[PDB]
Design an enzyme around this catalytic site. Sequence first.
Site, PDB file in Angstrom:
ATOM      1  N   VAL A 152       0.851  -1.187   0.000  1.00 57.72           N
ATOM      2  CA  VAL A 152       0.000   0.000   0.000  1.00 57.72           C
ATOM      3  C   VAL A 152       0.891   1.243   0.000  1.00 57.72           C
ATOM      4  O   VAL A 152       0.552   2.278  -0.586  1.00 57.72           O
ATOM      5  CB  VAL A 152      -0.863   0.034   1.280  1.00 57.72           C
ATOM      6  N   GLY A 153       2.040   1.131   0.659  1.00 60.11           N
ATOM      7  CA  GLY A 153       2.917   2.278   0.896  1.00 60.11           C
ATOM      8  C   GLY A 153       3.899   2.113   2.049  1.00 60.11           C
ATOM      9  O   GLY A 153       4.308   0.989   2.387  1.00 60.11           O
ATOM     10  N   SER A 154       4.235   3.244   2.671  1.00 57.10           N
ATOM     11  CA  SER A 154       5.502   3.387   3.384  1.00 57.10           C
ATOM     12  C   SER A 154       5.465   4.550   4.376  1.00 57.10           C
ATOM     13  O   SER A 154       6.342   4.658   5.252  1.00 57.10           O
ATOM     14  CB  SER A 154       6.611   3.591   2.343  1.00 57.10           C
ATOM     15  N   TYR A 168       7.518   4.698  10.020  1.00 54.78           N
ATOM     16  CA  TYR A 168       7.984   3.751  11.034  1.00 54.78           C
ATOM     17  C   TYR A 168       7.536   2.310  10.691  1.00 54.78           C
ATOM     18  O   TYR A 168       7.374   1.457  11.576  1.00 54.78           O
ATOM     19  CB  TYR A 168       7.520   4.178  12.453  1.00 54.78           C
ATOM     20  N   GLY A 169       7.351   2.047   9.397  1.00 53.37           N
ATOM     21  CA  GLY A 169       6.947   0.712   8.900  1.00 53.37           C
ATOM     22  C   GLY A 169       6.380   0.725   7.481  1.00 53.37           C
ATOM     23  O   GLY A 169       6.117   1.787   6.893  1.00 53.37           O
ATOM     24  N   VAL A 201       3.284  -1.016   4.827  1.00 57.45           N
ATOM     25  CA  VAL A 201       1.877  -1.359   5.001  1.00 57.45           C
ATOM     26  C   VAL A 201       1.438  -2.180   3.790  1.00 57.45           C
ATOM     27  O   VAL A 201       1.578  -1.696   2.643  1.00 57.45           O
ATOM     28  CB  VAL A 201       0.973  -0.067   5.132  1.00 57.45           C
ATOM     29  N   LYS A 231       0.318  -3.417   8.942  1.00 56.41           N
ATOM     30  CA  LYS A 231       1.547  -2.616   8.990  1.00 56.41           C
ATOM     31  C   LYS A 231       2.598  -3.392   9.773  1.00 56.41           C
ATOM     32  O   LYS A 231       2.373  -3.741  10.973  1.00 56.41           O
ATOM     33  CB  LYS A 231       1.295  -1.260   9.660  1.00 56.41           C
ATOM     34  N   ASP A 261      -3.481   8.357  13.981  1.00 51.71           N
ATOM     35  CA  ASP A 261      -2.202   8.810  14.547  1.00 51.71           C
ATOM     36  C   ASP A 261      -1.310   9.356  13.451  1.00 51.71           C
ATOM     37  O   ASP A 261      -0.660  10.366  13.637  1.00 51.71           O
ATOM     38  CB  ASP A 261      -1.473   7.682  15.299  1.00 51.71           C
TER      39      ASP A 261
END
EC number: 2.7.11.24
Length: 334
Positions: free
Chosen positions: A26-28, A29-30, A32, A47, A162
């Site tokens: 999906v994408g990119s 602190y970790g 996903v 994630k 968050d």
Amino acid sequence: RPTFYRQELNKTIWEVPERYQNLSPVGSYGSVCAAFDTKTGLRVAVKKLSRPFQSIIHAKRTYRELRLLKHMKHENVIGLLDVFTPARSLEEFNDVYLVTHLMGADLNNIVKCQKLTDDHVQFLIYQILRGLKYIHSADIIHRDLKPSNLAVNEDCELKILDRGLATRWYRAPEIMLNWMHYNQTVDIWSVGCIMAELLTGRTLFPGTDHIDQLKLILRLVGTPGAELLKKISSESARNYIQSLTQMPKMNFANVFIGANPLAVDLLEKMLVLDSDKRITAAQALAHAYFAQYHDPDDEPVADPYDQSFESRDLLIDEWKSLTYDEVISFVPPP
Ligand SMILES: CCCCCCCCO[C@@H]1O[C@H](CO)[C@@H](O)[C@H](O)[C@H]1O
């Protein structure tokens, strides 16, 4: 326990329960993945935290994130569907995976590719302030409310997250003066900025840096009165403020000319210099602009949230073991 499988994805080696299927980046602190939950037939976000225990800073953050997400149980706030680790014991414990609803787009992915109706603006902002009441009732200050931190589906349903799927643009003035003692109403400022923008299609205060930001703010709301200036201890702030020609408080009605006049009134009560006088989340919810949406019996508060840990300097293995405890004790939703 369940049975896990490994898989390579974008250089990261993923290991999840078999219940999670069809993993895709999906994408990119970790990082996903989107994944298919065979248990519920629902698509989810998975994630993988990166280097969750890299340092004292990462480890406490990792614990902070897991504690927050376990606490958040409200339709307008991201909450936790699952957390797991391939680790069999604390001794092996090294990765943490978080699972939440798959959220497809943020508030920005909307504002930019549309022009919002007033009724959209009412629904979007009502949802924000409903979750924000909940967040605030836990004694949490969000501190980074902006369009990239708000998830919105095709059905224009919203949750506060968050972290996303320019901050300064939505930051309360007191934060850029490093005042320290913020109350919750720093988030109301941010909500006012977001609202302005939804109504207008323009960033309310596109400051270039923090000094520019203060400039753009004073042009709208005007120079601080006597009763406020006397609270600024910083000589330099005082001098910058007063050096900026005595600006008249613009009429909000002209800045937002053509907006529902009730949206203008609410905006005026949100974007007030003196954070003591800023309308709270609960107040705002009762403002007549939301008459269509408000229901005092369906605007709940949170259980009190123990954030004493924030006041602690612990060892990596201590934060790690605390986090490990939180994974193990996780009880999923209904
Ligand atoms: C933009 C130029 C001046 C900004 C004035 C900001 C006034 C902020 O408001 C102040 O914030 C503090 C909480 O952080 C409180 O201690 C003060 O009571 C409150 O009045």
